[PDB]
Amino acid sequence: PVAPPLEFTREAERAAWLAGALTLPSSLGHTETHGQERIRAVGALEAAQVTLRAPFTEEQFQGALYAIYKQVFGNTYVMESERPTTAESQLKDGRITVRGFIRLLAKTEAYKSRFLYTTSQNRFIELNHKLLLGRAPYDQAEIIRHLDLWNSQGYDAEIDSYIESEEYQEFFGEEVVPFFRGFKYQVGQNPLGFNGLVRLYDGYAGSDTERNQSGQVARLTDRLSRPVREQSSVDRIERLLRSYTS
Amino acid sequence: AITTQGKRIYKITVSEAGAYATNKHRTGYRAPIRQSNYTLTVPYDRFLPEMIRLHQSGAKIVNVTSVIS
Amino acid sequence: SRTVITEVIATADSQGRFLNSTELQAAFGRFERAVPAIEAARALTKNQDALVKGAVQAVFKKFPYVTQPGEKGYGDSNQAKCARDIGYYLRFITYSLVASGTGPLDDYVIAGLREVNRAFNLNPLWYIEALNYIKGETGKLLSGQSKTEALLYIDHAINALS
Amino acid sequence: SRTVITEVIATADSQGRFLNSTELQAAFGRFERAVPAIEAARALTKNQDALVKGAVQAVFKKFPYVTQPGEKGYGDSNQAKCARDIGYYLRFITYSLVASGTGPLDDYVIAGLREVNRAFNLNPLWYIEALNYIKGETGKLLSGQSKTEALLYIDHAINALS
Amino acid sequence: SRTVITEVIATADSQGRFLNSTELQAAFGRFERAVPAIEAARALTKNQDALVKGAVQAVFKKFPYVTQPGEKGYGDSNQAKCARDIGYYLRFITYSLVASGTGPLDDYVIAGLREVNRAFNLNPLWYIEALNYIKGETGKLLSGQSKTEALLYIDHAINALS
Amino acid sequence: MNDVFTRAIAQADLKGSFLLESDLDKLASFAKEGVKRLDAVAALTNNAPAIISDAAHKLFAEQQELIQPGGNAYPHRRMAACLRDMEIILRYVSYALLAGDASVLDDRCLNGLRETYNALGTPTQSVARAVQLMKDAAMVHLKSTANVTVGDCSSLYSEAATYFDKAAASIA
Amino acid sequence: MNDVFTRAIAQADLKGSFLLESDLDKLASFAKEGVKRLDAVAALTNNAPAIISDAAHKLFAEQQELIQPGGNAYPHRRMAACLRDMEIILRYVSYALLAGDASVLDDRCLNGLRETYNALGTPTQSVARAVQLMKDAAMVHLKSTANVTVGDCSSLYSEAATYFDKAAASIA
Amino acid sequence: MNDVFTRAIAQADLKGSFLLESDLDKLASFAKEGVKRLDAVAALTNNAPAIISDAAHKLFAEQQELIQPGGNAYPHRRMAACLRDMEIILRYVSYALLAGDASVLDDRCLNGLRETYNALGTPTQSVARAVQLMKDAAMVHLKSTANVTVGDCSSLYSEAATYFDKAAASIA
Amino acid sequence: MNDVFTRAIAQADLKGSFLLESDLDKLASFAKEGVKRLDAVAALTNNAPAIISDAAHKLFAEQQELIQPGGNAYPHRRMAACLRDMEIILRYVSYALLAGDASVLDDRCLNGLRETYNALGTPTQSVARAVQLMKDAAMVHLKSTANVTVGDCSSLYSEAATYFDKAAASIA
Numbered sequence A: 001p002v003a004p005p006l007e008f009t010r011e012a013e014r015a016a017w018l019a020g021a022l023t024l025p026s027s028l029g030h031t032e033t034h035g036q037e038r039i040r041a042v043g044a045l046e047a048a049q050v051t052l053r054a055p056f057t058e059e060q061f062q063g064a065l066y067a068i069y070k071q072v073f074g075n076t077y078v079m080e081s082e083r084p085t086t087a088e089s090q091l092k093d094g095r096i097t098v099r100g101f102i103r104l105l106a107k108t109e110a111y112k113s114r115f116l117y118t119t120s121q122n123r124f125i126e127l128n129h130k131l132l133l134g135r136a137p138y139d140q141a142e143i144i145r146h147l148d149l150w151n152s153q154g155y156d157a158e159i160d161s162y163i164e165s166e167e168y169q170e171f172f173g174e175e176v177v178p179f180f181r182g183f184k185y186q187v188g189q190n191p192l193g194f195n196g197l198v199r200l201y202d203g204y205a206g207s208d209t210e211r212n213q214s215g216q217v218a219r220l221t222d223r224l225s226r227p228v229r230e231q232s233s234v235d236r237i238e239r240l241l242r243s244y245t246s
Numbered sequence B: 001a002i003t004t005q006g007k008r009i010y011k012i013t014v015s016e017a018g019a020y021a022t023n024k025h026r027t028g029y030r031a032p033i034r035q036s037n038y039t040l041t042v043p044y045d046r047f048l049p050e051m052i053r054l055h056q057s058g059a060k061i062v063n064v065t066s067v068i069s
Numbered sequence C, D, E: 001s002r003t004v005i006t007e008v009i010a011t012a013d014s015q016g017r018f019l020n021s022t023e024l025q026a027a028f029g030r031f032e033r034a035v036p037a038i039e040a041a042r043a044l045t046k047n048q049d050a051l052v053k054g055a056v057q058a059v060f061k062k063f064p065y066v067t068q069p070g071e072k073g074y075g076d077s078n079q080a081k082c083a084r085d086i087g088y089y090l091r092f093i094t095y096s097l098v099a100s101g102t103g104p105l106d107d108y109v110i111a112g113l114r115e116v117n118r119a120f121n122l123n124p125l126w127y128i129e130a131l132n133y134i135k136g137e138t139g140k141l142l143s144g145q146s147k148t149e150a151l152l153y154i155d156h157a158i159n160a161l162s
Numbered sequence F, G, H, I: 001m002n003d004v005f006t007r008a009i010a011q012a013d014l015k016g017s018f019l020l021e022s023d024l025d026k027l028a029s030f031a032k033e034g035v036k037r038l039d040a041v042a043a044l045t046n047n048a049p050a051i052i053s054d055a056a057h058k059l060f061a062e063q064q065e066l067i068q069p070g071g072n073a074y075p076h077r078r079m080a081a082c083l084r085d086m087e088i089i090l091r092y093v094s095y096a097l098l099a100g101d102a103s104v105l106d107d108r109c110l111n112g113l114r115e116t117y118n119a120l121g122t123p124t125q126s127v128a129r130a131v132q133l134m135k136d137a138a139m140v141h142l143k144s145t146a147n148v149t150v151g152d153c154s155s156l157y158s159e160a161a162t163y164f165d166k167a168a169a170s171i172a
C-alpha cells in the first residue's frame, strides 16, 4: 500500500531527488546563452521602442529626435547645420506624425547626400530597407520593383513606397521610431533576411557612412545575388561551352 | 508636388469605429492602442493612395476640408 | 537583463546622454535595498530543498488526478521534471532578488512562457499553485523587508503564469 | 517636467504594463530621500537675495569689461536683468531640489537656451561664473545629503550651459 | 563492455573491495592516453569514405576472381555489401579507439565472427587484406603517437580474423 | 502629465515667486507617506488580474444582456476588448494613485473615451458600473492588513475612491 | 518559387519549345492525382501540433543536453524558438507538398538556414534530427486512412519523405 | 556495465553512425578533466570508514527505534548487515564516480534492492536516510583541499550527489 | 550589457546552480561601497566637458598634424567628430563604471570601432592616445577630495583605469 493517505511525501521526496541529474550543467553555453553576442546585435534588441504620444512633453522629445537620427542616418553624425528645425517644430504640435517627420528626413538633402549620390542603386535600396524598415531586402523582386519605381516616378515616390507601405503601417505605424527588427524572426521572411540584416549591421559602434575608404560599396547584392538568378546556371554552362567550342 | 497640383493640402477627419476594430482584433495590435477619432492632413498628390489605404484598414471618414483654396 | 542599473544605463544611452542626478538616485536606492534582497536570496537558497519538496507536494495535493496513470504526472520522469521546474522557478526568484529586478525572470521563465506551456500541454495552474505555496512559507521564513521583496518577485511570477 | 515618479509612470505606460518591482523600488528611493533635498531647498530659499547679490558681484569681478560701456552689462536696467536671471536660475534649482529631479530646471531653462543665448548675444560664461560662485558658497551653507543634492543640480545646470 | 576503466571496476568489484592505487594508476594512464586516440578517431572518421573505397578496391585487386560473374563479388548488391562491411569494421575500430579498449570490436565483430563467416562462405582473407589496406592508409593519415594506437587496433582486428 | 510635486511647482511658477511655507509643508507630509503609498500601488498591481476577473464576474452577474447575443460584449473578441479596456482604466487608476494627480488619467483618456464609446455603441452606465465594481474589489484587496504593517491609510482609500468615482462619472 | 506546372513551363521556355504532348501527359497525371495530394497536405496541416509535439518529445528524450542548463533549448525562450523553427519547417514542407516541387522549401526556407544556425551557435545535427523525427511522426498521420476514401498513395509518401530528407540534409 | 564512452558508443551504434564531432569533444573533455575524477574517487576510497562511521552515528542517534530490541538493526548480525550495506553502496557509488556513469550502480546494487529490503521488512525510508547521510559525510571529504592542487570541482560534486540521490531514490 | 550582479547570475545559471554564499558576499560588498561608485560616476559626469576639453587641448598640442590641412581632423566636421567620439567614449566609461563591468563597452561602445576607424582612415593610435589623455584628465576629477567625504577609493581608480585602458586597447 504505497500511499493510501493524501500526503505525497515519498513521491515528492523522490521527485526532488531525481530532479538533481536533470539540472546538471550541459556541454557549454558561454557564448550560447546569448547568440546575439555572436550576432553582435544585443544593443539594437535591448533598445526599447521609442514613441511620441499625443500629450508628449519636452522631455524625451529630444530623445525621440536622437533616436530618429541614429536610426535613419545610421550612426553617421548629423551636425545641427543639417537638422531641419521646421520639421521638428511641425512635429512638436502634432501637425505631422513621426512617420511624416521621417518622410521629411528621408527627403532632405542630408539623407540623399549620405545614401543616394555616392552609392549605386542596389546599395540605395539596401540602405532604404535597413533604415526606414529595419530589415534587409528579401529578393530581387523588391530590388526590381524599387528600381523601376525610382526610374519611373522619382525619389519621392521611391521613398513613399517605403514609408506609406503596409509593412511600415503595422510594425511601426504613425508614432514608432524604426528599429532593427530583422534579427528577430519576422513573419513571412526568407532565412536570408536575417543574414542580410546581420551583414549590413556591422555593430553598435559602426555605421553605413559615405565618407570612408571603400566609397560605400554594396554589401548584400552579393548575398542576395545567387538565389534569384542562378537557377539557370546549369544550362547556361552548356550554352557557354557551345559558344566557346565554335 | 512642385506644380500647382502638389499644393492645396486637405484636412481629413478619420474615425476608426468597430468596422475597423474587428479587423484589428483578427489581425492584432502591433502599434500602441490609439483613440478611434482624430484629424489628419494629406497632400493632393498622395490623397488617392492614402485614402484607399485608410479604407483598406476599415476606418471611416467624417468629412474633408481644404486647407488651401 | 533589466536591473535598476541596466535599465538606467539603457534609458540614458537611448538619449545619448550622461547619467544625471535622477539616474544615480535610482541606483542609490537600488544599492540601499540590495541588502534585504541579497539576504532574502541567501535565505531562499539555504532552504531550496525544503521549498522544492513542499511545492511538489502541494501541486500533487491540489491536483491529485495528475499523478494517476494515463496522465502527465504519472511516471518518475514527469515528477522529476516537476521538481526540476520548481527548482528553476525558485532559482530565478533568487536571481531576481540578487539583481534587484525582474530581469532574470523575464529573460528565462517568462520569455516564451505560454507557447511552451501550450505546445507541451503543461498547465499554468500547477506552477501557480507551487508558487502560491512557496509564497506561503516565504512569508513565514523572511522577516519584514526581505519578505516584501521575495513576495513581490513571487507575485510577478504568479501573475506572469496567470 | 517630470521627476522619478512621472518618468516611472511614463515608462510603465509606454510598455503597456503595470509598475513592477524595479519601478516601485526607484520610486521608493525617491520618496524616502525627498526630505534632505527639501531641507536643502529650505536653506536655499532662506538665502535667495544674498545669493543674487553675491552671484552678480562675482560675475562682475570675473568679467570687468561687462560693466564698462560698450558691453551689455553697462546700465542699471541691465544690472537688474542680470539679478533677475540669476534669481530665476536659483529658483529653478530649488524647484528641481523639491521635485527631486532635473525636470523643472531642464524644461524651464535648458529647453531653448542655446538659441536664446545666440539671439540676445548673452555669454553663457557669465551664468557659468555666477553658478560657480553659487556652488562655492553652497559648500558651506548645506551639509550632508542636502548639500550634495544641491551641488549635483548646480553642476547639471552648469554642464547644460556648456 | 571491456575497456580500461571497465576492466578496472570489474576487477575491483569481483574481489569486492574499493578501488586501490593500482586501479587508479591504470585509470590515469588511460585518461592521459585518451587524447591521441581521440584525434585518431577524428582522422579515421573524417576519411571514412576514401578509406572504404580504397579498401574495396584493394579487395578487388588482391582477389581478382571474386568480381567475376557467378561468385560472391559479382552483382551491385554484393559490392554494396562489401562497402557496408568495410564501413562496419572501420566504425568499430574508431569506437574502440574512443573507448581506449578493445571492447566494441570484441562485442560487435569478433564475437561470433567465425560462425557467421563460415555460414555465408565469406573468406576471412578478404577482410584481412582490406584491413591491411586501411592499416597502410593510416600510415600517412596519422603520424606520431596516435598512429601507434590506430595501428594497434587495426592489427588486433586482423589477428582476430586470422 | 504632472504629479503633486510638479503641480505645486507649476502653481508656484505661475504665481512666479518661490515656494512658500505651506506648499513645502504638504510636500513633506506627502513625502513621509511615500512608502505608505507605494504599498497601495503594489497591492493594486499585484491583484490587477484578480480585480479584473472579479469585476468581470460581478458585472456579468447583475447585468446579463451583454452575454446574450446582440450585446456590446456578446462576441468573443468584443468581450476580450472589454476586459482590455477595463484593465487599462484600472492601470491608469493605479497611476493616479501613485502620482496623486488625476490629470495624467484625465487628459489622456477621460476626454477621448466618451466620444469613442459614443461611436462604438457601448452603454456608458455599464462602464461606470464596471468602474465601481473595480472600486469595491480594489478596496477589498487594499484594506488587507495582513503581510504589511498596519496604519491609518484612510487617506489613500479615500483618494482611490475619488479616482474611481471621477472615472465613473467622466466616462458616463 | 515554382510548382511543377511552372517547372514544365520554364523548361519548355528556356529551350524555346512548346510543351510536348508527353509533358502535358505527366502534368495531367499530376492534376488527376492532385486530390490525393490535397488530402496529404491537409493531413500535414490539421495535425501540425501533434507532429511537432511528438517530434519534440522524442528529440528531447534522445539528447537531454538541449534542455538542461547550458543547452541550446534551455532558457525557455530558446525552447519556444525551437518549436517555432519546427513549425516553420513543417509549414514549408506542406507548401512543397501542395506545390509538387521543393522550390518553396529550397528557396524561402533552406537557403540561408545552415549558416543562420552557425551564427546563432545552434547545433545543426540536432535540427536535422528534429526534421527527421517530424518526418517519422508525420508519416503516421499522412497514412491515416480514417475519414477519407481509400487508395494507393505511395507516390506522395515517397514525395514527402524526399522533402523531409531534403530539408534535413540542407540544414545539417 | 558501462562508462560514459561506452554509453556514447552504444547510442551511436543504435543510430548506426560514426561518433559525432560534439560527442568526441565531450568524451575528450571528460578524459582531460578526469584527473579531478581520480582525486575524487581516491578521496571516497581513502576516507570510506570515516564516511560510514559518521553516517551510522548520525542515523542511529537520529533514528533510535532501529537499535532497540525488536528494532531492525538490533542484534550484532543485523547491525553488521547494516554497515555492510552502507559500505557496499558507497563502494558502488565510487565505482560509478570513476566510470562517470551510474550503470554499474543501477545494475549491480539497485536492480533488486527495494524488493529485497521490502521482503526483509527493512524500512526503506531509513535506508534512503542513511544514503543521504553518507552523501553529506562524503561531500565533507571531497571538498577538502589538503594534499591536492587547488582547483574547481563543482561538477564532480554535483555528479557524486546525483549518484547518492540515484541510490537513495531507487531504494526508497 | 550586464552589471556585476547580472554577470554573476549568468555564471551561476551556466553552472546550473543557485548563487553561492561567497558570490553573494562579493555582491553585498559591491552594493555596500556603491555610494563611492556613484560619486566617481557623478565626478565623471559633472566634470565631463572639462575632461573632453582638456584632453582635446593636450592631444592637439602634442599631435599637430591632425588639424593641419589634409590632416585627419582638419575641417570643422572632423573636429566635431573628434569631440563626439571622445564624449561618447567618456560616457561609455562612466556607464561601465556604474554597472561595474565592461559589458556596456564591448556591447555598444567598442562593438565595431576598429572596423569603423580602419574604414575612415583614422589613425587608431591617435584615438587611443586621446583615451589615455581622457584617463589622465579624469583621474584628477575622480580624486577630487573636495565636496565629498574622505575615504579610500583605490579600487574605483584601478577599475576606471582598466576601463579606459580596455577602450584604448580595443580602439588601438
Ligand SMILES: CCC1=C(C)/C(=C/C2=NC(=C\c3[nH]c(/C=C4/NC(=O)[C@H](C)[C@H]4CC)c(C)c3CCC(=O)O)/C(CCC(=O)O)=C2C)NC1=O
Pocket: H057, H060, H061, H067, H073, H074, H075, H076, H077, H079
Ligand atoms: C544485541 C547485541 C548488541 C550490543 C551489545 C550492542 C552494543 C552497541 N554499541 C554501540 C556503540 C557504543 N558502545 C559504547 C560502550 C562504551 N560506553 C563506555 O562507557 C564503555 C567504556 C564502553 C562499554 C564497556 C559507546 C559509548 C558507544 C557509542 C558510539 C556511538 O555513539 O556510535 C551501539 C550503537 C548505539 C549508539 O550509537 O547510540 C550499540 C547498539 N549492539 C548490539 O546489537
Ligand SMILES: CCC1=C(C)/C(=C/C2=NC(=C\c3[nH]c(/C=C4\NC(=O)[C@H](C)[C@H]4CC)c(C)c3CCC(=O)O)/C(CCC(=O)O)=C2C)NC1=O
Pocket: A120, A121, A122, A123, A140, A143, A144, A147, A148, A229
Ligand atoms: C543607377 C545605376 C545602376 C544601374 C543602371 C544598374 C543596372 C541593373 N541591371 C540589372 C539586371 C539586368 N541588366 C540587364 C541588361 C544587360 N543584359 C543584356 O544583355 C544587355 C546587353 C545588357 C544591357 C546593356 C538585364 C537584361 C538585366 C536583368 C537580368 C535578369 O533578370 O536575370 C539590375 C538588377 C535588377 C534590375 O534590372 O533592376 C540592376 C540594378 N544598377 C545600378 O546601381
Ligand SMILES: CCC1=C(C)/C(=C/C2=NC(=C\c3[nH]c(/C=C4\NC(=O)[C@H](C)[C@H]4CC)c(C)c3CCC(=O)O)/C(CCC(=O)O)=C2C)NC1=O
Pocket: B016, B017, B018, B019, B021, B022, B033, B034, B035, B036, F066, F072, F073, F077, F078, F079, F081, F082, F083, F085, F086, F088, F089, F108, F109, F113, F116, F120, F122, F123, F126, F127, F130
Ligand atoms: C487610453 C487607452 C485606451 C482605452 C481605455 C481604450 C478603450 C476602447 N475600447 C474600444 C472598443 C470596445 N470596448 C468595449 C467595452 C464595452 N463594451 C462592454 O463590454 C462594457 C460595458 C464595456 C467595457 C466595460 C467593447 C466590447 C469594445 C469592442 C467594440 C468592437 O470591437 O467593435 C475602443 C475602440 C477601438 C478598439 O477596439 O481598440 C477603444 C478606443 N482604448 C485605448 O487605446
Ligand SMILES: CCC1=C(C)/C(=C/C2=NC(=C\c3[nH]c(/C=C4\NC(=O)[C@H](C)[C@H]4CC)c(C)c3CCC(=O)O)/C(CCC(=O)O)=C2C)NC1=O
Pocket: C059, C066, C072, C073, C078, C079, C080, C081, C082, C083, C085, C088, C089, C108, C109, C116, C120, C122, C126, C127, C130, G057, G060, G061, G067, G073, G074, G075, G076, G079
Ligand atoms: C528555464 C526555465 C524552464 C522551465 C520553466 C521549464 C518548464 C518545462 N518542463 C518540462 C518537462 C515536463 N513538465 C511536466 C509537468 C510537470 N511535471 C509533472 O509532474 C507536474 C504535474 C508538473 C509540474 C507541477 C511534464 C509532464 C514534463 C515532461 C513531459 C512533456 O514534456 O510533455 C519541459 C519540456 C522539456 C522536456 O521534454 O523534458 C519544460 C520546457 N523548462 C525550462 O528550461
Ligand SMILES: CCC1=C(C)/C(=C/C2=NC(=C\c3[nH]c(/C=C4\NC(=O)[C@H](C)[C@H]4CC)c(C)c3CCC(=O)O)/C(CCC(=O)O)=C2C)NC1=O
Pocket: C145, C148, C149, D021, D024, D025, D028, F032, F033, F035, F036, F038, F039, F040, F042, F043, F142, F143, F144, F145, F148, F149, F150, F151, F152, F153, F156
Ligand atoms: C518595493 C515596494 C515597497 C514595499 C513592499 C514596501 C514595504 C514597507 N512598508 C513599510 C511600513 C508601512 N507600510 C504601510 C502600508 C500598509 N499599511 C496598511 O495600513 C495598508 C494595508 C498598507 C497600505 C495600502 C504603512 C502605513 C507603513 C508605516 C509607515 C507610515 O506610513 O507611517 C516600510 C517602511 C519601514 C517599516 O516597515 O517600518 C516599507 C519599506 N516598501 C516599498 O517601497
Ligand SMILES: CCC1=C(C)/C(=C/C2=NC(=C\c3[nH]c(/C=C4\NC(=O)[C@H](C)[C@H]4CC)c(C)c3CCC(=O)O)/C(CCC(=O)O)=C2C)NC1=O
Pocket: A032, A033, A034, A035, A036, A183, A184, A185, A186, A189, A190, A191, A194, G066, G072, G073, G078, G079, G081, G082, G083, G085, G086, G088, G089, G108, G109, G113, G116, G120, G121, G122, G123, G126, G127, G130
Ligand atoms: C522562414 C524560414 C526561417 C527559419 C527556419 C528560421 C530559423 C531561426 N531560428 C532562430 C532562433 C532559434 N532556433 C532554435 C532551435 C534549435 N535549438 C535546438 O537545437 C533545436 C534542436 C533546434 C530547433 C529545431 C534556437 C535555440 C533558437 C535561438 C538561438 C539563440 O537564442 O541562441 C532564428 C533567429 C531569430 C530568433 O531569435 O527567433 C532563426 C532565423 N528563420 C527563418 O526566417
Ligand SMILES: CCC1=C(C)/C(=C/C2=NC(=C\c3[nH]c(/C=C4\NC(=O)[C@H](C)[C@H]4CC)c(C)c3CCC(=O)O)/C(CCC(=O)O)=C2C)NC1=O
Pocket: G032, G033, G035, G036, G038, G039, G040, G042, G142, G143, G144, G145, G146, G148, G149, G150, G151, G152, G153, G156
Ligand atoms: C475540402 C477540401 C478538399 C479535400 C479535403 C479534398 C480531398 C478528396 N479526396 C477524395 C477521394 C480520395 N482521397 C484520397 C486520399 C486518401 N486515400 C489514401 O488512401 C490516403 C489515406 C489518403 C491520401 C494519403 C484518395 C486516394 C481518393 C480517391 C481518388 C482517386 O481514385 O484518385 C475526394 C472525393 C470523394 C468525396 O468528395 O467524398 C475529395 C473531395 N478535396 C477537396 O476539394
Ligand SMILES: CCC1=C(C)/C(=C/C2=NC(=C\c3[nH]c(/C=C4\NC(=O)[C@H](C)[C@H]4CC)c(C)c3CCC(=O)O)/C(CCC(=O)O)=C2C)NC1=O
Pocket: E021, E024, E025, E028, H035, H036, H038, H039, H040, H042, H142, H143, H144, H145, H146, H148, H149, H150, H151, H152, H153, H156
Ligand atoms: C594514483 C592515483 C592518482 C591521483 C590521486 C592523482 C591526483 C592528481 N591531481 C592532479 C591535478 C588536480 N587535482 C585536482 C582535484 C583536487 N583539486 C580540487 O580542488 C579538489 C580539492 C580536489 C578534487 C575534488 C585538480 C582540480 C587538479 C588540477 C586540474 C587542472 O586544472 O589542470 C594531477 C596532475 C598533476 C598535478 O597538478 O599534481 C594528478 C596526477 N593522479 C593519480 O593517477
Ligand SMILES: CCC1=C(C)/C(=C/C2=NC(=C\c3[nH]c(/C=C4\NC(=O)[C@H](C)[C@H]4CC)c(C)c3CCC(=O)O)/C(CCC(=O)O)=C2C)NC1=O
Pocket: A075, A076, A077, A204, A205, A206, A207, A209, A210, A211, A212, I066, I072, I073, I078, I079, I081, I082, I083, I085, I086, I088, I089, I108, I109, I110, I113, I116, I120, I121, I122, I123, I126, I127, I130, I131
Ligand atoms: C557607440 C557610439 C559611437 C562611436 C564610438 C562611434 C565612432 C565613429 N566615429 C566616426 C567619425 C570620426 N571620428 C573622428 C575622431 C578621431 N579621429 C581623430 O584622430 C581624433 C583624434 C580622434 C578622436 C578621439 C574623426 C576624425 C572622424 C571622421 C573621419 C572621416 O570622416 O573620415 C564615425 C563615422 C560617422 C560619420 O560618418 O560621421 C563613427 C561611427 N560612432 C558611434 O555612434
Ligand SMILES: CCC1=C(C)/C(=C/C2=NC(=C\c3[nH]c(/C=C4\NC(=O)[C@H](C)[C@H]4CC)c(C)c3CCC(=O)O)/C(CCC(=O)O)=C2C)NC1=O
Pocket: C021, C022, C024, C025, C028, D033, D144, D145, D148, D149, D152, I032, I033, I035, I036, I037, I038, I039, I040, I042, I142, I143, I144, I145, I148, I149, I150, I151, I152, I153, I156
Ligand atoms: C544622486 C544620488 C546621491 C549620491 C550619488 C550620493 C553620494 C554619497 N556620498 C556619500 C559619502 C561618501 N562618498 C565617498 C566617495 C568619495 N570618497 C573620495 O575619496 C572620492 C573623491 C569619492 C569617490 C571616488 C565616500 C568614501 C563616502 C563615505 C562613505 C563610505 O566610505 O562608504 C554618501 C553616504 C552618506 C555620508 O556618509 O556622507 C552618499 C549617499 N548621495 C546621493 O543622494
